[PDB]
Each structure stands twice: as C-alpha cells, then as structure tokens.
Design a protein around this nucleic acid. Structure first.
Ligand SMILES: CC[C@H]1OC(=O)[C@H](C)[C@@H](OC(=O)NCCCOCCC#Cc2ccc3c(=O)c(C(=O)O)cn(C)c3c2)[C@H](C)[C@@H](O[C@@H]2O[C@H](C)C[C@H](N(C)C)[C@H]2O)[C@](C)(OC)C[C@@H](C)C(=O)[C@H](C)[C@H]2NC(=O)O[C@@]21C
Ligand SMILES: [Mg+2]
Lengths: 120, 215, 114, 122, 48
RNA sequence: UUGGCACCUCGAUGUCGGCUCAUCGCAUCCUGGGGCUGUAGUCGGUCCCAAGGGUUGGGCUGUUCGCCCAUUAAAGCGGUACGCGAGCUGGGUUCAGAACGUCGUGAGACAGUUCGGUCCCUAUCCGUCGUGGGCGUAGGAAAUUUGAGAGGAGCUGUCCUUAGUACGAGAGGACCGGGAUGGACAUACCUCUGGUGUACCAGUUGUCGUGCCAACGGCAUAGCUGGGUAGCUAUGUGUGGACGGGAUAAGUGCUGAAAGCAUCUAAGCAUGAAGCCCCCCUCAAGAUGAGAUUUCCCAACUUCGGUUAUAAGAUCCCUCAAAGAUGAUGAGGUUAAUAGGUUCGAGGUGGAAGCAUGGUGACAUGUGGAGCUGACGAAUACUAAUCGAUCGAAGACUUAAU
C-alpha cells in the first residue's frame, strides 16, 4: 500500500475524512494517489452497507465521520443513514466496482495529477 | 547429461527416511521442448535449445510479451511447438540423444542425482557498503561521525587515484548464481515438479536452469 | 490456501493419526528414540506453549520442568518420530502463545481443567 | 550461543557455584559454543571447601543453554539457563554428582561419564 | 569541495544536452477535435 | 631507525596513536616441495625453492613498542606523505586557566609532571562503484549465442584406519592413502529457529467527544502491554573452495661425451610444489577485428533516389512488481486477470455484536475456534488499463568464385 507522504495518524484521519466527504458528495476532486487509496476504503464501507445488520452498522461507524446532510424538503439524516438506506439499495445487485476514476490534467500550483473519484 | 528449464514456486519441507527434516524448493518444469540441435559444423559447438512455459499465439496489435511476435512464432513452428516464454540451451548434454521437437520431462531426473541450479538473484536495489559488501561499520558512539560509509578509498600521493575494484555502494542483486552439488529428493511426473534439497536463487515465480553437476 | 503445488507435493507427509489440541493443554508426546541399538520410546510430558503455520510446516512447543530447570522442546506436528500424542488433560487459557510461563514456577503456573 | 565474558552456572558438586568463560576452544577465531563444546573459564563463586577453589583456571563443558539446539528431525531443545560442568582433561567430571538435566548431544562428544552421572538425558 | 576551475561554455552546453522538456502526451479528442492529454478528460468538452 | 645536507613546500604540504578500507614486496610466521643433519620415526636445528591463501581475543598504558593471560597451523618483517582526518576519533602532543617540584631577585621558565580545554567545507575535474541515452557494427528487426580478454575463488585443523604396525632395551612412535567431522571465510535463500513488522488481532490507564448506559472514535512515543502476516533479515537454513589434466621451481634422476674414466648436460628425455596454465564461478563482440546460429519483414513512386510512408519490430500513453533513486528490467492493456473491489481460502489473533441463563455487584457461560484479518493462494470483468498518436526497411562499391 501507499503512505501518501504522511504519518500514520494523519493518514488514517485523512483517508476516513476523504471517504466521508465522498459519501456526502458522490463525486470529489483530488490527486491520483489519494484517490487510488480512498477507493478501497469507500468500497469496503459500501460493503458494510450492503448487509445492514447491526454488527456491520456498528463496525462501519468506526470510519465514517459524524456529519449531517440537509436533503430536499429540509430532511436531515447522517452519513451512516445515507450509506445504509440510499446507497445499499443502489448497489444491491452489483458485485464490485462501486467507484470509477477519471484522470484530469495537472493542476497549476503543483504538477499533481488531479482526478475526480466518483461513486458510480 | 540432463537439463530442464523450470521456475521456482517456493520452499517447504519433507521428512526423510530416518526422520530427518529435509529442506526443499518446489520447482515446476512443464512442456520443456527442444527447439534446435546446434552442431559443430553448422554453428561451431554442439548443444540443444529448450523452450519453457507457453506464450499465447500471435495477434495483431499486441502490446505485451504475453503473445508471441512474428519472429518467435516462426522459430517455434519449425519445431512444431507453441511459442515459449524462456529459451536456454545446454552444452553438457549429448546432442544426439535429443530430437528437435521432443518434450523434456521432469522424469529425466531420478531420486538422488547431483544437479546445479542456475538462476538469478533477488534484487535488493541500491545499497551501501555494509549490506552489499559485508563491511564492518564504525563506532556508533564515543563521538563518532562514521556510521556506515566505506572507509578510505585509497592511499595518498602514491596512487593519487582509487584502484579498480574498491568496493563502494550501488545496486545489489540481478546476478547469475550457480549453487553446486544439490540433489533431487523426488520427481513428481503428474504435477510436473522436481524437488531439490536446499534453496535456490531468485524471486518466487522466477527461472532456474537445472542441469547435472560438472564436478 | 497456500500454493497448490506446495500443498500437493507435501500432502503425503502429513499425519492424520494425530489428535486435536490447543495451547495450554498439558500432554504426553511419545517419541521413537533410536538411541543405542534400540528404538525405545521416551514419554515426554509438557504443556503446549504455541503452534505455527499449517502444512508440513506446523510446529508446536511443549514446556516442562525437569529438575527445577525449565526445558522446552519444539516438535514438528507431522514428524514421523512421534508415535502418539495424548491430550492428558485440557486447559483454559486466553492466549495463542504462552510465552509468559518462562518467569513463573510452582502454583503460579496453574491451569484449570476444561 | 556462548562467547567469552559469559557467566554460566556449574551443574556439579565440584565446588564451583558459578563461573565465567575466556575462550572457546576449537579454532582460530571461534567465537561461540553450544552443548557439547569445551570452554576455558575461571570460577567466581566456590563452595567453602570443594576440590576447585575460587580464582582457578579450568577446562569445562556446556550441558544446557538457553539458545538450545536443533536436532536432525526439526526438533529443538531449549533450556531456561546456561550451565557447564568441569572436566579433568579426560572428558571426565571433577565432582562426583551432576545437577540438573543434560542434553542428549553430549553422548556423541563422548562425555559419557557426564551422561551417566545425570538426572535426565534429553 | 569547490570548483577547481571554470566550466567552459563547451562543457556547460555539453552537460545539458539531455536537459529538456518532452512534448506532452497529447491526442485528439473524439467529441471536439481539440487536443487533450491521453487518459485524461478533455477540458474543452468534458468527455470520457 | 638515529642522524648529516638544506634541494620543493612558511600568500599553511594537519605530525602521534586508534577506527574503516586496503594494496604491494619477500630477506616466509603457517601451509606445499626438497638437500641435509651430531636426522632411528615423532622430534627439532640448518639451508634451498617458494608471496596462492591464511596470518586470534583480551588485561596494562594516549601510547607505537613491550610485558602478561588464554588460544591457534601460524599469531611474519617491511613499503605505501613512519598508507588512509575534504573517510572518523582526538586519549598523547603544541595556545590562552590552574596547581605542585625545580631554576630565576622578577616578569616568567622547563619537551619535568598534573586537571581542564570550539576537528569547518552543498565535490567542478581526473579517479572509482553502479546505472541510462546517442551513434557504429553496408537493410530493418525479435530471440539464442562462441569467447579475444577480465574479474572471483585459492586457507586449514582434529579424530579414526592402516597400526600400536614400521622404528624402537624401552619410553615412545608414521610415512604414505582412505575415511569421517570441524574452525575461519564467500555466496544463495526464508522451509525451520529467531528478529522486526507505525493501515493485522487482542487487553488495558487518564482524558475529551459522538446526548445517555452499553458500543466506538481522537490524544497521550504506535499511550502502554501480549502476540503477529507478507516483506526484509542472522545468530537460521543449503551450498562452495572437490577432482583432474598440461608446462615448471629448488630437487631427483636416465642415457651420455668433451675429458676411451667419471659425470644431471652439451645434444635428448625423464620426473617433480598450496606456485604457472587449464580445469571451477561470474562479466564479456565499443573484441571499431565490432564475430556465429535460427527465424521474421520484402513496394512503388522515381524522372533518377539526399524518395514518401509503411512492414517485421518497438515506443508514446496507461494497470502493475519477481524489478526499482530516476530512467532501465520484467508482468499486463478489453480479442484483458495487470491492479483495485467482490467471493472462497491460507496464515495471524483468540471466543465479535445481540440475545438468554446465573450473580447484589465486579463478572461468567452457550450461541460460535465465533468475529476481525495489510502485502499471501485461487475464481470472477464489477471498476480502471476505453480513444488514439509517434518512431521504424527497400539494402554501396571492388574483386574472386557462382
Ligand atoms: C566552525 C567554522 C570555522 O572553522 C573552524 O573554526 C575549524 C574548527 C578550524 O579547524 C581547526 O581549528 N583545526 C583543526 C583542529 C586542530 O586541533 C588541534 C588542537 C588545537 C589547537 C589550537 C592552537 C592554538 C590556538 C590559538 O592560538 C587560538 C587563538 O585564539 O589565538 C585559538 N585556538 C582555538 C587555538 C587552538 C579551522 C579549519 C581553522 O583552520 C585550521 O587552523 C590552523 C591554523 C591550520 C589548519 N591547517 C592549515 C593545518 C587550518 O585548517 C581556522 C583558522 O579557524 C580558526 C580556519 C580559518 C580560515 C577561519 O577562520 C574560518 C573562517 C573559520 N572561522 C569560522 O567562523 O568559520 C570557520 C571555517
Ligand atoms: Mg596557495
């Protein structure tokens, strides 16, 4: 696996935060290396969501941050609830994938290959 | 006398007749085919070329060594064989006991022969003088600033130069090594595997050239 | 599994006449000692300390006290030199390797049955 | 793995209660030893009396070590303490008993009186 | 650990023979015909 | 070595010991071959040939040296700016402080002691260790190659047998060869023994937070503690220096005369060493002499090739690791298992959650070797290697055979 030029605690934190944000937005923009490394984490969380049993819920609560989404009509529900009620159904029949990645050109401030990781 | 191209799978252990633990390496020799029979008047030295494994056949627009190229298909079709992945030759063999197109099988080896396995070492990459050359390194305390670097590279004004062969840092690995006087413990003809006492050079999934000890 | 060719070429060396046990169980391993001019048997008695990866490569360790001097013997599980293993009595532990018995002597090294 | 400046217990009634080593016989540059190997050593704690007294230089044989030994079948024998026994330059002990277990590998080294005068051969 | 002498213009220009930028890996985009980097999304159109 | 001379260096050539790394001579310390002896063999002494390899660990001093304690087959002598400080130390010595003894009325002094006392430098060139690109090898390519050369190894102990034999009043005691095991050292590898394993498992303290109990997350060296997969590793596992040729050294001869004898010599022809050459391991056609074998590709405009673009072949680009600083090498790019995910498994950890039972409680038991599980094995196109682009032959003369 990759280290992302960062320590262990700071990476653990970055990976879980990036996975949460992806789950919120359903497509985000970042650099290749971190997309390649958040792919597995988000894919595994969705797996914890395709079962929905209380054990998997409690276990997926480890990674996701506690965030609130305001849906249409001022309806509110958290990241766990999204994962287990709006994304489990979408991928009940698909047996992998769950994400795609679309390389983009280098950014300006660096030569970093920005990419967009999106939930498929 | 005998030679087979194989690849290394791993190491395990077997127990011997009197209970002894035998350390072993599993080598997989399958579809070894003779592709030529070099001759003294045709090429200047008598030997035979063996192709191992099996590539796929030519395809237009290939982008990898998976498939054979037109040049290799032709070489192998002259021996009515499939394109192969690794090709080596053997000199110790009697060229007249082989035919262009035969299969060399694992059973060429009987239990208790003496063989030499020639492979390539594992790559360690760029390394320094203590790992690459076994050098004693300096003191780690008592106010030292010479921890792992190599020591003097020469003398002084006499030989105002560094002599060739001075053991300095660089790439380690990627060298052909021949371990000598190993032996085979069992030959299995169905899974096509020659088991060799000891350990052999190389990464897992590599290539070993087993032949009969020259000593 | 492990590599399939490794597992195939070494399947014949595995023993099946052996019982099932776990670290913490005290047991009697019997061994063909071919010492002198006889194949005798020495009933070695100890407490299993650990055991390792499967295949012919599984090895287990047993600990005893000889004359107030701790002795530990590692044995390959499928060694043909072991006639039989009797789990002389079971053992309630909470580890998989019992390294922490190298500092205790006497009742401190106590084990509950079952 | 026993090298010089290593303190060993004596497993005998020679007088010596505990000794340390200077060399490992057997070769130029030899550095270590295991069961069945002889070492030069000087006692550091003697019993009041005994045939061997404090500060003497003596030949001695290793009978049990914590590093222990591999046997040809893949069996390993390890111990909880280093130990040694004094010898009389004939592979024979200086004392009359021998305390504690001993490893079977001493049979080969023809330390038979050591193997015969022992609580447990192993 | 200091330059014992000057590096002449000849030596200088010689060392930097291999010091150059490579033309980009660009291919034409199938929806718009403008060039894009290979394996990247066209920035003019937004396709594949 | 102690000196003599003052020839280069005072717009600076760091000086002694130790550490790291060696390299070369042989007037050889061990090992190999011999002549001998006031050599019965083991013993020793002497001289000759021999430099291939090897030629310890400590106590004491800043010490080189030397002495001492244990070993070894031996613990060799020297050169290399008394090798090596832009590789290291800085104990001694040689700045300023201080102090004792001595000399000086005194300031101070002593190569008399003593305690303390700042070791800078980002490597341009040559050199050296690795690793790329270009071009040449009379076409363009893919693979296998011989070996001109070059490098690496090169050490040796003990035991048993012959044999208690030869030889010995005895005491003692092989030569040869033929077996067996070591030491040191070099290599390859992780199956075993261990080490480490900061995205594996588990227990636990303080504190903050997800309202709350229960569950969990952040921080405290990874908070700590017990384990531990892959990888990487030694102290761990195998292997190696085994034969055997050819020419020799001191030496030993054979036939043999000058010199009808002799005599190893002059013709010739023998034997003889860890030494030389080969043998064994590795690199090697930039070996500009550029070598060899097999295969693949083969047209059609010219207005005359100083020709397109294309073959065969690669590369760009992208998924990767048995490879890696980068670039290279190697496994793959949909006609696809290259990597991710999913499913199953190995190995690791050790009895998840929620329930029900029992306890006042701290907890325990069954579910259920359960739950979790980074690299390890297999299957599966679910996701990404979609699209495309660039480079790359048309084969010279001369002569001889055909
Ligand atoms: C940190 C960067 C600076 O580097 C340095 O300080 C290094 C460390 C220095 O190394 C050395 O000390 N010798 C190596 C250590 C030698 O130990 C033996 C025991 C002693 C002594 C001693 C004797 C007398 C006096 C003295 O009498 C007195 C007073 O006060 O009178 C003051 N003390 C201290 C004395 C002490 C440089 C390199 C030094 O050169 C060297 O000196 C010698 C004169 C000759 C050397 N060679 C020619 C043989 C030479 O190589 C200099 C003089 O530095 C003082 C360098 C000069 C150019 C500088 O000034 C530079 C700018 C430094 N200044 C600074 O700031 O950066 C520096 C680079
Ligand atoms: Mg000057």
């Amino acid at each position: 696996y990759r280290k992302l030029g960062r320590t262990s605690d700071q990476r653990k934190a970055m990976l879980r935060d990036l996975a949460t944000s992806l789950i919120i937005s359903e497509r985000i923009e970042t650099t290749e290396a971190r997309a390649k490394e958040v792919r597995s984490v988000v894919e595994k969380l969705i797996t914890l969501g395709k079962k929905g049993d209380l054990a998997s819920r409690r276990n997926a609560a480890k990674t996701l941050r506690n965030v609130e989404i305001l849906n249409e009509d001022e309806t509110t529900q958290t990241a766990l609830q999204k994962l287990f009620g709006e994304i489990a159904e979408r991928y009940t029949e698909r047996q992998g994938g769950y994400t795609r990645i679309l390389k983009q050109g280098p950014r300006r401030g660096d030569g970093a290959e920005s990419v967009i990781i999106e939930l498929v | 006398t005998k030679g087979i191209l194989g690849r290394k799978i791993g190491m395990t252990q077997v127990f011997g007749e009197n209970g002894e633990l035998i350390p072993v390496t599993v080598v997989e020799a399958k579809e070894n085919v003779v592709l030529q029979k070099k001759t003294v008047e045709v090429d200047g030295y008598n030997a035979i070329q063996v192709g191992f494994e099996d590539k796929k056949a030519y395809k237009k627009d290939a982008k990898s060594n998976k498939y054979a190229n037109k040049p290799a298909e032709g070489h192998a079709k002259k021996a009515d064989a499939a394109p192969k992945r690794f090709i080596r030759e053997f000199r110790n063999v009697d060229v007249d006991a082989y035919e262009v197109g035969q299969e060399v099988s694992v059973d060429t080896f009987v239990a208790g022969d003496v063989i030499d396995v020639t492979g390539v070492s594992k790559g360690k990459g760029f390394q320094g003088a203590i790992k690459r050359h076994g050098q004693s390194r300096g003191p780690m305390s008592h106010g030292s600033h010479f921890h792992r670097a190599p020591g003097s590279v020469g003398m002084a004004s006499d030989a105002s130069r560094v002599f060739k062969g001075q053991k300095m840092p660089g790439r380690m690995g990627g060298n052909t090594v021949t371990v000598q006087n190993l032996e085979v413990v069992q030959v299995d003809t169905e899974n096509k595997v020659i088991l060799v006492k000891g350990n052999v050079p190389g990464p897992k999934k590599g290539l070993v050239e087993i032949r009969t000890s020259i000593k | 599994t492990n590599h399939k060719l490794i597992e195939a070429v070494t399947k014949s060396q595995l023993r099946t006449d052996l019982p099932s046990f776990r670290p913490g169980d005290t047991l009697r391993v019997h061994v063909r000692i071919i010492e002198g001019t006889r194949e005798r048997i020495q009933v070695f008695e100890g407490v299993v300390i650990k055991r390792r990866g499967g295949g012919v490569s599984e090895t287990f360790t047993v600990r005893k006290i000889s004359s107030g001097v701790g002795v530990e013997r590692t044995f390959p599980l499928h060694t043909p030199k072991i006639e039989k293993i009797e789990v002389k009595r079971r053992g309630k532990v909470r580890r998989a390797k019992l390294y922490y018995l190298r500092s205790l002597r006497g009742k401190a090294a106590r084990i509950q049955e079952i | 793995m026993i090298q010089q400046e290593t303190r060993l217990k004596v497993a005998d009634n020679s007088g010596a209660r505990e000794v340390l080593t200077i060399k490992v016989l057997g070769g130029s540059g030899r550095k270590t030893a295991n069961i069945g190997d002889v070492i030069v050593c000087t006692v550091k704690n003697a019993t009041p009396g005994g045939v061997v007294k404090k500060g003497d230089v003596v030949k001695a044989v290793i009978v049990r070590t914590k590093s222990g030994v591999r046997r040809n079948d893949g069996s390993y024998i390890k111990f909880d303490e280093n130990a040694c026994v004094i010898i009389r330059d004939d592979k024979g002990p200086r004392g009359t008993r021998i305390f504690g277990p001993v490893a079977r590998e001493l049979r080969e080294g023809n330390f038979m009186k050591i193997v015969s005068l022992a609580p447990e051969v192993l | 650990a200091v330059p014992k002498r000057r590096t002449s213009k000849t030596r200088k220009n010689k060392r930097r023979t291999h010091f150059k930028i490579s033309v980009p890996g660009m291919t034409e985009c199938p929806n718009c015909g403008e060039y894009k980097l290979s394996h990247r999304v066209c920035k003019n159109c937004g396709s594949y």
